[PDB]
Lanosterol 14-alpha demethylase
Amino acid sequence: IVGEALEYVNIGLSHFLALPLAQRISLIIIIPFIYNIVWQLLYSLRKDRPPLVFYWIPWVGSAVVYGMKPYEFFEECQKKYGDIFSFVLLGRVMTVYLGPKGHEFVFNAKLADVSAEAAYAHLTTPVFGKGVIYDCPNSRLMEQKKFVKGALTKEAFKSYVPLIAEEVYKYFRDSKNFRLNERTTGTIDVMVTQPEMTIFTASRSLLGKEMRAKLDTDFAYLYSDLDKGFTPINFVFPNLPLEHYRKRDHAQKAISGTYMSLIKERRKNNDIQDRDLIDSLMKNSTYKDGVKMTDQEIANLLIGVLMGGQHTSAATSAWILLHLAERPDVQQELYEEQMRVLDGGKKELTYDLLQEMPLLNQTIKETLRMHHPLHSLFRKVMKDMHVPNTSYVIPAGYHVLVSPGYTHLRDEYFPNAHQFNIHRWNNDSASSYSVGEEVDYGFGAISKGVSSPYLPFGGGRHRCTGEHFAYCQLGVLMSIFIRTLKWHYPEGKTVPPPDFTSMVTLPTGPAKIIWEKRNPEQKIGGRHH
Ligand SMILES: CC[C@@H](C)n1ncn(-c2ccc(N3CCN(c4ccc(OC[C@H]5CO[C@](Cn6cncn6)(c6ccc(Cl)cc6Cl)O5)cc4)CC3)cc2)c1=O
Ligand code: HEM
């Protein structure tokens, strides 16, 4: 008789439901804990799954160790498991594929296989607004990138260079952090100065003079408020009825409204030239199926572009200053190049002369090697994926994670990878190079292969289109810093470690340097109060 047993099943269920609150809570925690461990042990038997990093806390997974030191986490996992492994992260399964083959697996993945917008939209859509970037099909993203790229041309860079330079000099003149007309030396936190110089220079050139002028007003606080919504938390909790979530939403409306006001004014007065990215999107924001971007979508796109350029660039120029603060030999070498290319300062800086500054560009290139702003790029897997030359299948609903910044720091691909050396790029100073065949996903011909161990700007359909703007902006900024100042560390201070829990791998603050004027008597002209 198994009927007796079946009765006692029902009996036990009833005795289970009648447990005292103490055991119920205990079982509420013990039961999922035990199942999680048993599920992992069983999971490890599958040969059609990459190894899964073991974890104790259900749902949480490896989030703490991954979040604090992802490259150390990746190195340990790589030693135990090789280049392909999974780990649980706040309810999601991330499948990591390290090295150039991982770049290929994820950046060149078929459009049907993975989705960037499914990984990213819940964060970006609240900050930028509806209809653009990840709040739209990939084919719309492809053309938005084409629109923006049409404003980021050599001719645009030629006119951005003197504008960015004016903004840097104005910042040296007026910012409390410098005031070069009044002080010949001082101490700055580069995580204060660089966000400010970045937003001032990017506003002036991409958004134009009106939007730049707005940052000298209370309006600037909206950018700060909107900036707070750009945090990895939004990957988990994109919306919570908390205050800073509402300040973010309000900022997005207020800022996009400011942009729309300007757009509608310009159209009303027929004042549509070729000054800035706003002009360009007003003239060139019609999809190939004939639909026009709305004024709201244009403004949302402007927010996304400005916010994306903001954090990558400001972290990168901070890192450049930090690495050079302990390398007075590199500052000297860069200074000699400035004197040579600009004839002792008798030539004004232009976009073309910037391209004749290989050491300066190598300094940016090397900083981006050692400090990839984005340590982990993700896609959500939409269809099961066979990992070539393995028996592994990545099922739909998993996430794939690619980390070119991890490979940037591997000795095998960059000898003495943890040493800052701009001369490893001698006779190779371009921001990136297409080493073979090319392909066009909708926004211009880019490298077909994505197997370079150096991939600061990603590859494939989601490849960065800001790279040349970033080099222009960082180039102008660093040319002027080098020609104007020397800098060094407070005693006993050195390059800080990266903060891998922020949106970008910015330096852990406060990160202070001491600057001094190369020409204490040099004055910056212009009006100021
Ligand atoms: C909770 C416990 C704690 C210990 N913990 N546990 C885990 N973590 C953690 C894990 C991972 C991460 N992150 C860091 C951020 N990261 C990430 C950030 C941005 C990103 O952007 C990719 C897309 C979307 O944004 C942009 C960024 N960009 C590109 N170029 C310039 N910016 C983008 C592209 C285009 C446009 Cl228009 C705008 C933008 Cl912002 O590209 C991708 C990954 C993911 C991992 C942070 C913390 C923790 O802190
Ligand atoms: C040092 C500076 C920068 C670095 C290292 C960088 C890096 C990257 C990377 C790695 C990606 C791909 C993300 C992924 O594959 O998930 C990307 C995408 C992108 N970035 Fe940048 N970026 C920088 C600056 C900028 C700037 C200044 C802009 C705009 C002016 C910009 C706009 C974009 C856009 C539009 C995309 C396309 C995203 C997509 O198609 O999904 N970036 N960037």
Notes: The pocket of protoporphyrin IX containing FE (ligand 2) is lined by residues 116, 141, 145, 305, 308-309, 312-313, 316, 368, 373-374, 377, 456-458, 462, 464-466, 469-470 (CB under 6 Å). Residues 164 and 201 are 5 Å apart (CA to CA). The chain has one domain: 121-517.
